[PDB]
Write an enzyme that holds these catalytic residues in place. Sequence first.
Site, PDB file in Angstrom:
ATOM      1  N   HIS A  45      -5.780   5.118  -0.095  1.00  0.00           N
ATOM      2  CA  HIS A  45      -4.634   4.608  -0.528  1.00  0.00           C
ATOM      3  C   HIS A  45      -3.517   3.329   0.747  1.00  0.00           C
ATOM      4  CE1 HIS A  45      -1.556   7.499   1.355  1.00  0.00           C
ATOM      5  NE2 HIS A  45      -0.869   6.375   2.172  1.00  0.00           N
ATOM      6  N   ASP A  93      -7.760  10.699  -3.081  1.00  0.00           N
ATOM      7  CA  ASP A  93      -6.921   9.977  -1.980  1.00  0.00           C
ATOM      8  C   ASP A  93      -8.226   9.922  -0.605  1.00  0.00           C
ATOM      9  OD1 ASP A  93      -5.706   8.029  -1.084  1.00  0.00           O
ATOM     10  OD2 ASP A  93      -4.199   8.905  -0.614  1.00  0.00           O
ATOM     11  N   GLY A 186       3.036   5.543   7.669  1.00  0.00           N
ATOM     12  CA  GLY A 186       2.065   5.168   8.640  1.00  0.00           C
ATOM     13  C   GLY A 186       1.268   6.529   8.897  1.00  0.00           C
ATOM     14  N   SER A 188      -0.132   8.338   7.457  1.00  0.00           N
ATOM     15  CA  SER A 188      -1.589   8.430   5.839  1.00  0.00           C
ATOM     16  C   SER A 188      -2.830   8.283   6.411  1.00  0.00           C
ATOM     17  CB  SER A 188      -1.038   7.505   4.859  1.00  0.00           C
ATOM     18  OG  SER A 188       0.737   7.110   4.384  1.00  0.00           O
ATOM     19  N   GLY A 189      -3.897   9.335   6.005  1.00  0.00           N
ATOM     20  CA  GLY A 189      -4.981   9.132   7.017  1.00  0.00           C
ATOM     21  C   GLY A 189      -5.291   9.611   7.562  1.00  0.00           C
TER      22      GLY A 189
END
Length: 240
Positions: A45, A93, A186, A188-189
Amino acid sequence: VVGGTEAQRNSWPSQISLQYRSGSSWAHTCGGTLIRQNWVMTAAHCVDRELTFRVVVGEHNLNQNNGTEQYVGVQKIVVHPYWNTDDVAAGYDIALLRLAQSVTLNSYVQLGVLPRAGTILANNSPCYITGWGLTRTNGQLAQTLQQAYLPTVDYAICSSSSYWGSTVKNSMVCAGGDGVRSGCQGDSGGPLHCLVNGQYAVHGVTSFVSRLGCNVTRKPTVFTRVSAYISWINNVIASN
Ligand SMILES: *[C][C@](*)([N]C(=O)[C]([C])[N]C(=O)OC([C])([C])[C])N(*)(*)(*)(*)[C@](*)(*)=O
Ligand SMILES: [Ca+2]
Protein backbone atom coordinates in the site's frame (compact mmCIF):
# COMPACT_ATOMS: atom_id res chain seq x y z
CA VAL A 1 5.78 5.07 16.42
CA VAL A 2 3.60 6.05 19.42
CA GLY A 3 5.22 5.61 22.87
CA GLY A 4 8.69 5.03 21.39
CA THR A 5 12.10 6.03 22.49
CA GLU A 6 14.81 7.34 20.26
CA ALA A 7 16.95 4.73 18.63
CA GLN A 8 20.75 4.74 18.59
CA ARG A 9 22.19 5.53 15.18
CA ASN A 10 23.60 2.13 14.52
CA SER A 11 21.01 -0.12 16.04
CA TRP A 12 18.76 -0.95 13.12
CA PRO A 13 20.93 -0.62 9.94
CA SER A 14 18.51 -2.37 7.61
CA GLN A 15 15.82 0.25 8.18
CA ILE A 16 15.15 2.52 5.22
CA SER A 17 13.05 5.58 4.56
CA LEU A 18 10.83 5.43 1.48
CA GLN A 19 10.22 8.90 0.15
CA TYR A 20 8.30 10.48 -2.67
CA ARG A 21 8.91 13.58 -4.70
CA SER A 22 6.88 16.42 -3.53
CA GLY A 23 7.36 19.65 -5.53
CA SER A 24 10.98 20.53 -5.19
CA SER A 25 11.55 18.31 -2.21
CA TRP A 26 11.18 14.78 -0.95
CA ALA A 27 8.86 13.57 1.72
CA HIS A 28 8.89 10.53 3.99
CA THR A 29 5.96 8.25 3.47
CA CYS A 30 6.89 4.72 4.60
CA GLY A 31 9.60 2.54 6.02
CA GLY A 32 11.13 -0.54 4.49
CA THR A 33 13.86 -3.10 5.02
CA LEU A 34 16.99 -3.50 2.89
CA ILE A 35 17.14 -7.17 1.96
CA ARG A 36 19.75 -7.16 -0.80
CA GLN A 37 22.15 -4.35 -1.84
CA ASN A 38 19.73 -3.49 -4.57
CA TRP A 39 16.40 -4.71 -3.17
CA VAL A 40 14.06 -3.26 -0.52
CA MET A 41 11.01 -4.89 1.11
CA THR A 42 8.07 -2.62 2.00
CA ALA A 43 4.25 -2.72 2.07
CA ALA A 44 2.31 -2.76 -1.19
CA HIS A 45 0.00 0.00 0.00
CA CYS A 46 2.96 2.36 0.28
CA VAL A 47 3.44 2.20 -3.46
CA ASP A 48 -0.16 2.32 -4.56
CA ARG A 49 0.25 5.86 -5.81
CA GLU A 50 2.09 6.41 -8.99
CA LEU A 51 4.70 8.73 -7.59
CA THR A 52 8.41 9.13 -7.97
CA PHE A 53 10.04 7.24 -5.15
CA ARG A 54 13.46 7.16 -3.61
CA VAL A 55 15.03 5.18 -0.85
CA VAL A 56 17.36 6.58 1.79
CA VAL A 57 19.66 4.15 3.61
CA GLY A 58 21.88 5.08 6.64
CA GLU A 59 19.27 7.54 7.72
CA HIS A 60 18.70 8.71 11.26
CA ASN A 61 17.47 12.35 11.46
CA LEU A 62 15.18 13.11 8.55
CA ASN A 63 15.79 16.79 8.67
CA GLN A 64 19.56 16.95 9.12
CA ASN A 65 22.70 15.80 7.44
CA ASN A 66 24.11 12.91 9.44
CA GLY A 67 27.14 12.13 7.16
CA THR A 68 25.93 8.53 6.66
CA GLU A 69 23.08 8.61 4.14
CA GLN A 70 22.91 7.20 0.67
CA TYR A 71 20.18 8.18 -1.70
CA VAL A 72 19.06 5.91 -4.44
CA GLY A 73 16.22 5.76 -6.95
CA VAL A 74 13.63 3.06 -7.38
CA GLN A 75 13.95 1.36 -10.68
CA LYS A 76 11.21 -1.33 -10.50
CA ILE A 77 8.29 -2.03 -8.22
CA VAL A 78 7.00 -5.62 -7.87
CA VAL A 79 3.87 -5.80 -5.71
CA HIS A 80 2.37 -9.07 -4.64
CA PRO A 81 0.01 -10.41 -7.50
CA TYR A 82 -2.76 -10.88 -5.05
CA TRP A 83 -2.63 -7.47 -3.33
CA ASN A 84 -5.83 -5.57 -3.45
CA THR A 85 -5.91 -1.93 -2.49
CA ASP A 86 -9.54 -2.05 -1.43
CA ASP A 87 -8.97 -5.00 0.81
CA VAL A 88 -5.91 -4.64 3.11
CA ALA A 89 -7.54 -7.13 5.51
CA ALA A 90 -7.11 -9.77 2.87
CA GLY A 91 -3.33 -9.59 3.30
CA TYR A 92 -0.62 -9.65 0.65
CA ASP A 93 0.49 -6.26 1.75
CA ILE A 94 4.04 -6.61 0.52
CA ALA A 95 6.15 -5.28 -2.32
CA LEU A 96 9.73 -5.42 -3.40
CA LEU A 97 11.60 -2.49 -4.86
CA ARG A 98 14.56 -2.83 -7.13
CA LEU A 99 16.97 0.00 -6.63
CA ALA A 100 18.62 1.87 -9.42
CA GLN A 101 22.10 1.23 -7.96
CA SER A 102 23.56 -1.12 -5.33
CA VAL A 103 24.16 0.58 -2.01
CA THR A 104 27.36 0.32 0.03
CA LEU A 105 27.20 -1.68 3.17
CA ASN A 106 28.84 -0.40 6.31
CA SER A 107 27.94 -0.08 10.03
CA TYR A 108 24.99 2.08 9.10
CA VAL A 109 23.71 0.09 6.14
CA GLN A 110 23.25 -3.64 6.46
CA LEU A 111 20.95 -6.29 5.13
CA GLY A 112 17.96 -7.41 7.19
CA VAL A 113 17.92 -11.01 8.23
CA LEU A 114 14.78 -12.84 7.07
CA PRO A 115 13.12 -15.74 8.99
CA ARG A 116 12.90 -19.24 7.66
CA ALA A 117 9.78 -20.01 5.72
CA GLY A 118 6.82 -21.01 7.92
CA THR A 119 8.19 -19.69 11.19
CA ILE A 120 5.53 -18.67 13.68
CA LEU A 121 6.49 -16.88 16.90
CA ALA A 122 5.20 -17.88 20.26
CA ASN A 123 2.87 -15.48 22.00
CA ASN A 124 4.54 -12.64 23.68
CA SER A 125 7.76 -12.96 21.73
CA PRO A 126 10.17 -9.98 22.14
CA CYS A 127 10.05 -7.68 19.17
CA TYR A 128 10.74 -4.06 18.36
CA ILE A 129 9.00 -1.79 15.87
CA THR A 130 11.04 1.00 14.31
CA GLY A 131 10.15 4.06 12.16
CA TRP A 132 9.77 7.75 11.54
CA GLY A 133 5.93 7.62 11.66
CA LEU A 134 3.57 9.70 13.72
CA THR A 135 4.34 9.87 17.35
CA ARG A 136 0.72 10.44 18.32
CA THR A 137 -2.56 9.58 16.60
CA ASN A 138 -3.16 12.52 14.19
CA GLY A 139 0.18 13.97 15.30
CA GLN A 140 3.29 14.49 13.29
CA LEU A 141 6.30 12.54 12.05
CA ALA A 142 9.32 11.88 14.12
CA GLN A 143 12.54 13.59 13.19
CA THR A 144 14.74 10.85 14.44
CA LEU A 145 14.21 7.11 14.26
CA GLN A 146 12.04 5.77 17.01
CA GLN A 147 11.67 2.31 18.45
CA ALA A 148 9.16 0.62 20.69
CA TYR A 149 9.04 -2.74 22.39
CA LEU A 150 6.12 -4.53 20.97
CA PRO A 151 5.64 -8.22 22.05
CA THR A 152 3.66 -10.46 19.74
CA VAL A 153 0.04 -11.38 20.18
CA ASP A 154 -0.46 -14.79 18.60
CA TYR A 155 -3.12 -15.57 16.02
CA ALA A 156 -5.57 -17.21 18.38
CA ILE A 157 -5.66 -14.20 20.62
CA CYS A 158 -5.45 -11.59 17.91
CA SER A 159 -8.28 -13.02 15.87
CA SER A 160 -10.57 -13.23 18.90
CA SER A 161 -13.57 -10.94 19.25
CA SER A 162 -12.10 -8.42 21.57
CA TYR A 163 -9.00 -7.92 19.45
CA TRP A 164 -9.20 -7.83 15.65
CA GLY A 165 -11.63 -10.65 14.93
CA SER A 166 -11.85 -11.75 11.32
CA THR A 167 -9.83 -8.84 10.10
CA VAL A 168 -6.56 -10.57 10.99
CA LYS A 169 -5.45 -13.57 9.02
CA ASN A 170 -2.79 -16.20 9.67
CA SER A 171 -0.59 -14.53 7.04
CA MET A 172 -0.22 -11.64 9.50
CA VAL A 173 1.65 -10.97 12.80
CA CYS A 174 0.07 -8.93 15.53
CA ALA A 175 2.23 -7.10 18.04
CA GLY A 176 1.52 -4.73 20.94
CA GLY A 177 -1.99 -3.59 21.82
CA ASP A 178 -1.23 -2.18 25.24
CA GLY A 179 -2.83 1.23 24.50
CA VAL A 180 0.47 3.11 24.91
CA ARG A 181 2.94 1.86 22.31
CA SER A 182 2.24 1.17 18.68
CA GLY A 183 3.01 1.66 15.02
CA CYS A 184 1.27 4.65 13.42
CA GLN A 185 1.00 6.34 9.96
CA GLY A 186 4.45 6.65 8.22
CA ASP A 187 5.74 3.47 9.90
CA SER A 188 3.95 1.39 7.29
CA GLY A 189 6.26 -0.88 5.23
CA GLY A 190 8.84 -0.90 8.00
CA PRO A 191 10.29 -3.78 10.07
CA LEU A 192 9.18 -5.65 13.08
CA HIS A 193 12.47 -6.97 14.44
CA CYS A 194 12.22 -10.06 16.64
CA LEU A 195 14.95 -11.75 18.67
CA VAL A 196 15.24 -15.37 17.68
CA ASN A 197 18.21 -17.55 18.68
CA GLY A 198 20.21 -14.53 19.73
CA GLN A 199 19.72 -12.71 16.42
CA TYR A 200 17.23 -10.04 15.38
CA ALA A 201 15.29 -11.04 12.32
CA VAL A 202 12.60 -9.09 10.41
CA HIS A 203 9.36 -10.98 10.96
CA GLY A 204 6.84 -8.27 9.99
CA VAL A 205 6.26 -5.60 7.42
CA THR A 206 4.04 -2.92 9.09
CA SER A 207 0.63 -2.92 7.47
CA PHE A 208 -2.17 -1.38 9.51
CA VAL A 209 -3.56 0.02 12.68
CA SER A 210 -7.07 0.75 13.87
CA ARG A 211 -9.23 3.44 12.25
CA LEU A 212 -9.85 4.61 15.76
CA GLY A 213 -6.26 5.43 16.50
CA CYS A 214 -2.81 4.11 16.47
CA ASN A 215 -2.39 3.11 20.13
CA VAL A 216 -5.64 1.43 21.00
CA THR A 217 -5.94 -1.20 23.72
CA ARG A 218 -6.56 -4.64 22.24
CA LYS A 219 -6.00 -3.42 18.72
CA PRO A 220 -2.32 -4.35 18.20
CA THR A 221 -0.36 -3.17 15.26
CA VAL A 222 -0.73 -5.61 12.35
CA PHE A 223 2.08 -6.77 10.20
CA THR A 224 2.49 -8.79 7.04
CA ARG A 225 4.09 -12.09 8.17
CA VAL A 226 7.33 -12.22 6.26
CA SER A 227 7.83 -15.97 6.74
CA ALA A 228 4.71 -16.62 4.74
CA TYR A 229 6.37 -15.01 1.74
CA ILE A 230 9.88 -16.35 1.56
CA SER A 231 9.33 -18.35 -1.64
CA TRP A 232 7.76 -15.41 -3.42
CA ILE A 233 10.58 -13.07 -2.31
CA ASN A 234 13.23 -15.39 -3.54
CA ASN A 235 11.41 -16.04 -6.84
CA VAL A 236 11.20 -12.34 -7.57
CA ILE A 237 14.86 -11.61 -6.81
CA ALA A 238 16.05 -14.59 -8.83
CA SER A 239 14.43 -13.23 -11.98
CA ASN A 240 14.38 -9.46 -11.78
C1 LIG B 1 1.57 5.83 4.01
C2 LIG B 1 1.20 6.42 5.40
N1 LIG B 1 2.11 7.56 5.58
C3 LIG B 1 1.59 8.70 6.04
O1 LIG B 1 0.42 8.80 6.27
C4 LIG B 1 2.46 9.96 6.26
C5 LIG B 1 3.86 9.62 6.69
N2 LIG B 1 2.00 10.97 7.20
C6 LIG B 1 2.25 12.23 6.78
O2 LIG B 1 2.74 12.45 5.71
O3 LIG B 1 2.29 13.34 7.72
C7 LIG B 1 1.10 14.03 8.14
C8 LIG B 1 0.67 13.50 9.51
C9 LIG B 1 -0.10 13.89 7.18
C10 LIG B 1 1.46 15.51 8.21
N3 LIG B 1 1.01 5.35 6.42
C11 LIG B 1 1.99 4.41 6.68
O4 LIG B 1 3.11 4.81 6.70
CA1 LIG C 1 19.69 12.75 7.90
